[PDB]
Amino acid sequence: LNCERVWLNVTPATLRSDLADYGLLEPHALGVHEGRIHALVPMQDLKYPAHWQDMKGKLVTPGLIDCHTHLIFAGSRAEEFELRQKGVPYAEIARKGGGIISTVRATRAASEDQLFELALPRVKSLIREGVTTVEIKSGYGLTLEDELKMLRVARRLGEALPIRVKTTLLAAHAVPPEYRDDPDSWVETICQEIIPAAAEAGLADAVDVFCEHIGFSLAQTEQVYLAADQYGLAVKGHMDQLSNLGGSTLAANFGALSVDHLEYLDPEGIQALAHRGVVATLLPTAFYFLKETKLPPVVALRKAGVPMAVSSDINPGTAPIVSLRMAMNMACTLFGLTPVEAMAGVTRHAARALGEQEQLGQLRVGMLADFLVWNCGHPAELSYLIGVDQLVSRVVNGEETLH
Numbered sequence: 001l002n003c004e005r006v007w008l009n010v011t012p013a014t015l016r017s018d019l020a021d022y023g024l025l026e027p028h029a030l031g032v033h034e035g036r037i038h039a040l041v042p043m044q045d046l047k048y049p050a051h052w053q054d055m056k057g058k059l060v061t062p063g064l065i066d067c068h069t070h071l072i073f074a075g076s077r078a079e080e081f082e083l084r085q086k087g088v089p090y091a092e093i094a095r096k097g098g099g100i101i102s103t104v105r106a107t108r109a110a111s112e113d114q115l116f117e118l119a120l121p122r123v124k125s126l127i128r129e130g131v132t133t134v135e136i137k138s139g140y141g142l143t144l145e146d147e148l149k150m151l152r153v154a155r156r157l158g159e160a161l162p163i164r165v166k167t168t169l170l171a172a173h174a175v176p177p178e179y180r181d182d183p184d185s186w187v188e189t190i191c192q193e194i195i196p197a198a199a200e201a202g203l204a205d206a207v208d209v210f211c212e213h214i215g216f217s218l219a220q221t222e223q224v225y226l227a228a229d230q231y232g233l234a235v236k237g238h239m240d241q242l243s244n245l246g247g248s249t250l251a252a253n254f255g256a257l258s259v260d261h262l263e264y265l266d267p268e269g270i271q272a273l274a275h276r277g278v279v280a281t282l283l284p285t286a287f288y289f290l291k292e293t294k295l296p297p298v299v300a301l302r303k304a305g306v307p308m309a310v311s312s313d314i315n316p317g318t319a320p321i322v323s324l325r326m327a328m329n330m331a332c333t334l335f336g337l338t339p340v341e342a343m344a345g346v347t348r349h350a351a352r353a354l355g356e357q358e359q360l361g362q363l364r365v366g367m368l369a370d371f372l373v374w375n376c377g378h379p380a381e382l383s384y385l386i387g388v389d390q391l392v393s394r395v396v397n398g399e400e401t402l403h
């Protein structure tokens with residue numbers, strides 16, 4: 001079996017695009033070579049070495065992927081939240097510094113080393129849940145130096161821990177205080193300085209925008225995308241979360257990897273996404289914490305065949321929950337997804353959302369060897385039972401990482 005590492009007797013939920021549901025197969029032997037799945041052979045065709053690990057029929061799935069997080073940040077909005085729960089009017093909270101700006105001030109003030117130290121434990125929670133690839137965004141700096149410093153912390157995390165990290169420049173998350181009366185000059189700084197400096201330093205894998213009434217207009221959004229294109233950077237966007245400005249269609253035209261939130265996505269946007277092969281990313285935890293009532297158009301997205309990814313949206317003000325599995329559970333409960341859709345949402349579709357559809361998310365020969373051996377019987381459990389370590393083996397790039 002011409003490869004150096006082999007797992008015997010694994011029951012694979014391949015999650016192959018061409019196989020129904022979970023793509024579950026009879027017991028197999030999984031061999032890896034040079035960080036890639038080198039062979040998948042039915043145990044019945046075999047009858048070890050000795051360093052060949054026998055999983056004794058335990059379930060194996062591709063590593064989990066959560067394609068939309070803001071897990072890098074400093075400060076705490078817990079007290080602000082408490083003031084709100086107590087009845088203190090939002091206006092009062094705001095004038096004293098509450099809101100996203102609060103996170104921005106804390107993050108700007110925090111040193112690169114501090115942000116790294118603050119992010120370590122957050123990533124560790126995802127790791128033990130089975131997350132092998134995580135996407136992390138900037139957007140809490142709102143200055144060239146602070147945006148790039150966040151991207152660097154993200155790069156550091158990937159080097160320091162056994163996990164793949166995709167970085168996303170999200171400088172247009174909000175208009176910084178210094179540009180309050182000049183929203184349009186902030187856009188130019190992004191296009192002519194921040195994106196360029198980020199690209200030159202190889203710090204951004206993609207560019208993202210918060211297209212919203214309390215964010216950036218469709219026009220301002222188009223500006224960024226144009227700049228990202230010039231430096232050969234992939235794009236994506238935060239859209240239709242609170243309102244529909246037509247951002248989803250625009251993103252689709254630019255060949256956006258994906259569009260996130262989608263609470264207010266319309267029929268035309270859906271057609272666009274389906275045609276351009278854009279991934280629709282559902283962020284149920286944010287929907288929950290914000291007590292939103294307008295549900296994303298899941299039914300229409302399904303009818304149109306638009307793949308839906310599921311992610312945690314870990315962030316200080318909107319989704320303070322560091323768990324991808326909780327998000328899967330909420331996608332099912334709040335959005336009506338099936339456990340199988342949720343699973344595909346954190347593997348196959350999440351991979352595509354990050355432009356890694358050819359390298360991750362499925363147990364196919366030739367793709368990266370990122371998989372997990374669980375102690376639970378069926379993959380449906382991954383969306384059901386939450387908060388319990390259940391990994392027996394976590395392999396990234398062909399290597400055991402659990403120890």
Ligand SMILES: [Fe+3]
Nearest residue numbers: 070238313315
């Ligand atoms: Fe987000």
